[PDB]
């Protein structure tokens, strides 16, 4: 329970602290190899998505920022997969996510399905 | 997502960082007056609860750790009040809370209601 | 275009660079007052949302993480408002957003509309 | 027996003391390896809970903060297990805890039971 | 939960920390005036007990360590009074307390009541 | 024979003295290894009590602060054992102690006996 | 293809090579931190199994090597889970696995299902 | 499978290896702090048993090696407790264990139950 | 009785020890000729199995990894033969093993029998 | 007469001593040929037991860890034989041992007798 | 079990090892402060016995080696007390002990009781 | 004539002296061959006792620590034989020793006599 003035106040204090040469380097140098592990572990998972999804988008004739729309979608699908795992809940997620992109960003259902058909290998709606 | 290995790894790195004389003092001295504000702002609210609830418990002949049971309950009521506010949601909270203490710690429902009767001014269920 | 090997390689180089006491402090101390401005400028806008939405949620008896669900939704509405502005596009956004939360997280449509009714002042679909 | 003014007064003095570079580092560096042991000992116990509980939640189609509701519940069950141990008292605890979540946070009994069926392996109510 | 190994380990670390000239003096000098307040506030309350109880004991011909027995009893009564307050709960306390001294230390019930008759103003059981 | 003003006066002087960096560290560093011996010697004795007593309390379905009531009792029994030793006097002590907790804190005789049946191995009342 | 003569011949050559102080240490010191990662990453996953399965076995009164039978079974279930993942294939695996233990080692089907009920959260056959 | 010739052959090779100054010290110095942890963690648990059982034996007039008989029994009970945990399986264990000592070493059933009454808190058969 | 943290801790220490040029070579050079004996003794037994089993698989038209399925099965049959010996227990083993492969890996009973008909010379089910 | 703290203290000192390259090798190299004699003398005695007992277990259809149950039993019988010798006392031992395994580990009397019928050549109960 | 040849063989090996300058000093210097503790802890307990018993013996006119007889007896009583504790078992011990000295060394029962009357405070048989 | 403080003081000085590498090895290496003679001379005498006494105990059905009771007795008988020699005085010794064990340790007269009937060849009481 905090007001924005409190949120800011403390944020400011912590920002100031972090900006201190010693503090910054102490923390960052200590979490260096840790960060490396975390980056290495979870990132290549999405890079592989980008390659396959991109390929699909080329086959669908999608160019420019329109590709980025579907890339964002695909990446978000993969995210949920990592944090939830396959099965019921993922399907629930994807259903909402798909609809979200379709109507929020005018994403084309057909291509959206194609993206899902790479990451999951199959359409959503029902568990399969 | 993070495995135990990862949880600990990063925890360790940050713990180590913090333990550094200059890091600890930088952060802590920067958030000093901020923390002071927060402590002063909220703590008195719960002290008054401890006091009034204590008075009740003395009237009910409650001694030792048994007082502590009811004090914990009262403090929880106040916590929810601060983070939720009075009304419907609080009512929902208190009902569950009472169930928690009554059956998990064998707290006496009647006394619990006496505690609520102070903090809220009346037993819950109905808003008044 | 960049492969994973490339993504990581450069990320690592930049991470390492930043961790350097003088680099971190140079950058961070230079962007200090700038960041402060930005934080102060936009954050209060969302704090007021958290507050007003919280009030709503208390009226609806929403507790725990369930409040967090609706708070996230509300915050998203406000985000779009800031980066898009009111009107047609916002309407398009909210429609999709609601679909997202309703079906992905099983959020209660009616309560979601109550949230929108505060941030925008009315349910979407129509501009008013 | 202390007023809030006394609580604060001393708290302030101790906070000030701790913030001193020397004091902070003295204490923290001395309790370092000790903390490490304590963290290592009790934490992985709950991490394993998170993996299994999360898996269950995916099988039940639970997403978002709703998962967090059950994660909080499960973790709390495990806590009691560690501090109390299995048997009568634990059952007493779980019964109250379950009811608490059901009515305080509108947690779904069915899923709650599933969580218990992982941590304990069996439903509560009676010792088994 | 903590095993002996853990209990001691951390105790040792904190003891060591405290023994550091600067740590001890930092803490102690910071809580100086605070402690002074607390000592001055509560101690006089018990000194008056020692005095009045002593007077009683002289009237009853009580000498040596036997006085100390009754003094301890009286001090305990006063302690409870400060941390509980007069009324029901105090009555409950005193009854048990008397049982403690009468049977554990073979204290003379009649004299014990004389002590209570000063601190409270009358024997317990009934509130008056 | 001292008034509170004298008690305080000297207490203050000694507190002041102790707070001096040199005095604090001189004393504390000199009694360090001594303290360690004393802690090591008498503490694990009570830790073992806590394990067994706690186990019993779990078998009796005792939770929360109610456990603490019995823990306090058990620990106090063990204390007397160390300072008095088994036999007549201990029994005298326990009889008073038991009654004390029963009526002062509403402790349940049955559980109290169970605690004694761990520490001593047998009920009190008579030497056995 | 390789005959025994060939199998052994090469095995011997490689064994001899490895036994060389510098070869062994070169290899082992190079793969040290790598192995550490792998051990830390996967082992905790099975430790939690050993723990939870152990709890079950104690509830079923299983002692000695009989516990080891069921522990082996549980560990195998977890292994497949890690190398296959949940779903159809796992179900196929568990069915065969149960047959293996039930008939080859005379393991008790009912207890085996209790083990599965922990690791997976439910008996197999159906995915849930 | 291994014949005696093989059993011994390899045993000899490993024994010889270990006896090497550098091998022994390498291994032993590396596992030093680890072993220390393990010793400290578990040993105190059995020391408390030796103590409490000893107290019992003195009450029963047991002297010499006869004490050692019962001490061995008690230690075994505790061992199983640590490696199995309380409940059904422990009960099964103790029953057999008692049979072992009663008939193999002519231990006195009644005294054996007195030992169990301390370690577990009550005679076995029933869980309580 | 060990946690994973303990399992790891010691594993790490021992891994480190072994990686030491001297330790590695000491042990390995000492167990060299011993290992040779063990390898020579038990390996050619399975090599002969591979030849005959492979021949059968060719007669059954089995190719690729499908051969490997049956090779794994056959080798495992032979393993049990060595560690158990022919007779009742072996039959019990084979029955479970066969079923295991049939349902776990979809191995074809007909071919599985053929494999057994080489190693044992006769089908399982009953002792013959 | 020692506390655990004393047990540990000395254990630690001796462990440290032994870990010293010189101490380790001095002792171990001196007791080398002695150990060899002792190993050679008493080990093959039990190896022969393992062969015969194992054969029996195969004839009884015993597999897996169940064999190990009986192996443990048999080995323990042989142990007693070596340290006690045949006759009255051995029979007393075996009777308790048998019962121990039957009820502690659910070992099957029939097989247990078979094991004894190898090592001793005849059933226990009475001297024969 | 060990024959004389074996007893001596190993004794010799260990004796030789210990005689090594570095081995002796390693061990002895490591257990120095530990031994010191133990010596200081227990020895004073027996010195006081020697003193008080000596006083008695002077009162009884006991001189020369005759004093030594009774001193040995007294020391034995104290030994048992330390390793057994007072009560039943001690009584059993003393009775036998007296028989030992009275009839084996022709010690004077009456004086022996005088010794016990100091160490225990009274003659044995009855606990008081 | 020395206090414990003197006993300790000198003991400490001598312990320190002995712990010195040079002192330890000087003494120990000088008394090496001497010790060997003494060990060889007096030890096998008792080893032969252990064999015969043990055999007897097996014929009497004595197991576990109960054997050790009689072993201690027998060894002590043999000790006296060596230091006193057969005849009157030995008989006096044995009579007291026997009674000692019977009542101090509840040793069984019958078995005790059997032990004497090995070492001496005849019962005690009277010279024969």
Coordinates of N, CA, C and O in Angstrom, one line a residue, chain K residues 49 53 56 70 73-78 90-91 93-95 97-98 109-126:
Chain K
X49 N 36.9 -35.0 46.1 CA 36.7 -36.3 46.7 C 37.9 -36.7 47.5 O 37.8 -37.1 48.7
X53 N 37.6 -37.1 51.5 CA 37.8 -38.5 51.9 C 39.1 -38.5 52.8 O 39.1 -39.2 53.8
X56 N 38.2 -37.5 56.2 CA 37.6 -38.6 56.9 C 38.6 -39.6 57.4 O 38.6 -40.0 58.6
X70 N 41.0 -46.7 50.8 CA 39.7 -46.1 50.9 C 39.6 -45.0 49.9 O 38.5 -44.7 49.4
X73 N 38.4 -46.6 46.7 CA 37.0 -46.8 46.9 C 36.1 -45.6 46.6 O 35.2 -45.6 45.9
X74 N 36.5 -44.5 47.3 CA 35.8 -43.2 47.1 C 35.8 -42.8 45.7 O 34.7 -42.4 45.2
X75 N 36.9 -42.8 45.1 CA 37.0 -42.4 43.7 C 36.2 -43.2 42.8 O 35.5 -42.7 41.9
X76 N 36.0 -44.5 43.0 CA 35.2 -45.4 42.3 C 33.7 -45.0 42.4 O 33.0 -45.0 41.4
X77 N 33.3 -44.6 43.6 CA 32.0 -44.2 43.9 C 31.6 -43.0 43.0 O 30.6 -42.9 42.4
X78 N 32.6 -42.0 43.0 CA 32.4 -40.8 42.3 C 32.4 -41.1 40.8 O 31.6 -40.4 40.1
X90 N 23.0 -46.3 40.9 CA 24.1 -46.0 41.8 C 24.1 -46.9 43.0 O 25.1 -47.4 43.4
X91 N 22.9 -47.1 43.6 CA 22.8 -47.9 44.7 C 23.2 -49.3 44.4 O 24.0 -49.9 45.2
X93 N 25.3 -50.2 42.2 CA 26.7 -50.2 42.0 C 27.5 -50.2 43.3 O 28.4 -51.0 43.5
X94 N 27.1 -49.3 44.3 CA 27.8 -49.1 45.5 C 27.7 -50.4 46.3 O 28.7 -50.8 46.9
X95 N 26.6 -51.1 46.3 CA 26.5 -52.3 47.1 C 27.5 -53.3 46.6 O 28.2 -53.9 47.4
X97 N 30.2 -52.6 44.9 CA 31.5 -52.0 45.1 C 32.0 -52.3 46.5 O 33.2 -52.6 46.7
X98 N 31.1 -52.1 47.5 CA 31.5 -52.3 48.9 C 31.9 -53.8 49.0 O 32.9 -54.1 49.7
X109 N 34.2 -52.1 56.3 CA 32.8 -51.7 56.0 C 32.4 -50.4 56.6 O 31.8 -49.6 56.0
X110 N 32.7 -50.2 57.9 CA 32.3 -49.1 58.6 C 33.0 -47.8 58.1 O 32.3 -46.8 57.9
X111 N 34.2 -47.9 57.8 CA 34.9 -46.8 57.2 C 34.5 -46.5 55.8 O 34.3 -45.4 55.4
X112 N 34.2 -47.6 55.1 CA 33.7 -47.5 53.7 C 32.4 -46.7 53.7 O 32.2 -45.9 52.8
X113 N 31.5 -47.0 54.7 CA 30.3 -46.3 54.8 C 30.5 -44.8 55.1 O 29.8 -43.9 54.6
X114 N 31.6 -44.5 55.9 CA 31.9 -43.2 56.2 C 32.3 -42.4 54.9 O 32.0 -41.3 54.7
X115 N 33.0 -43.1 54.0 CA 33.4 -42.5 52.7 C 32.2 -42.2 51.9 O 32.0 -41.1 51.4
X116 N 31.3 -43.2 51.8 CA 30.0 -43.0 51.0 C 29.2 -41.8 51.6 O 28.7 -41.0 50.9
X117 N 29.2 -41.8 52.9 CA 28.5 -40.7 53.7 C 29.0 -39.3 53.3 O 28.3 -38.3 53.6
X118 N 30.1 -39.2 52.6 CA 30.6 -37.9 52.2 C 30.3 -37.7 50.8 O 29.7 -36.6 50.4
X119 N 30.6 -38.6 49.9 CA 30.4 -38.5 48.5 C 29.0 -38.4 48.1 O 28.6 -37.5 47.3
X120 N 28.2 -39.3 48.7 CA 26.8 -39.3 48.4 C 26.0 -38.5 49.5 O 25.0 -37.9 49.2
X121 N 26.6 -38.4 50.7 CA 26.0 -37.7 51.8 C 25.4 -38.7 52.8 O 25.0 -38.2 53.9
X122 N 25.3 -39.9 52.4 CA 24.7 -40.9 53.3 C 25.1 -42.3 52.7 O 25.3 -42.4 51.5
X123 N 25.0 -43.3 53.5 CA 25.2 -44.7 53.2 C 24.1 -45.1 52.2 O 23.1 -44.4 52.1
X124 N 24.4 -46.1 51.4 CA 23.5 -46.4 50.3 C 22.4 -47.3 50.7 O 21.8 -47.2 51.8
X125 N 22.0 -48.2 49.8 CA 20.8 -49.1 50.1 C 19.5 -48.3 49.8 O 18.8 -48.6 48.9
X126 N 19.3 -47.2 50.6 CA 18.2 -46.4 50.4 C 18.6 -45.1 49.7 O 19.8 -44.6 50.0

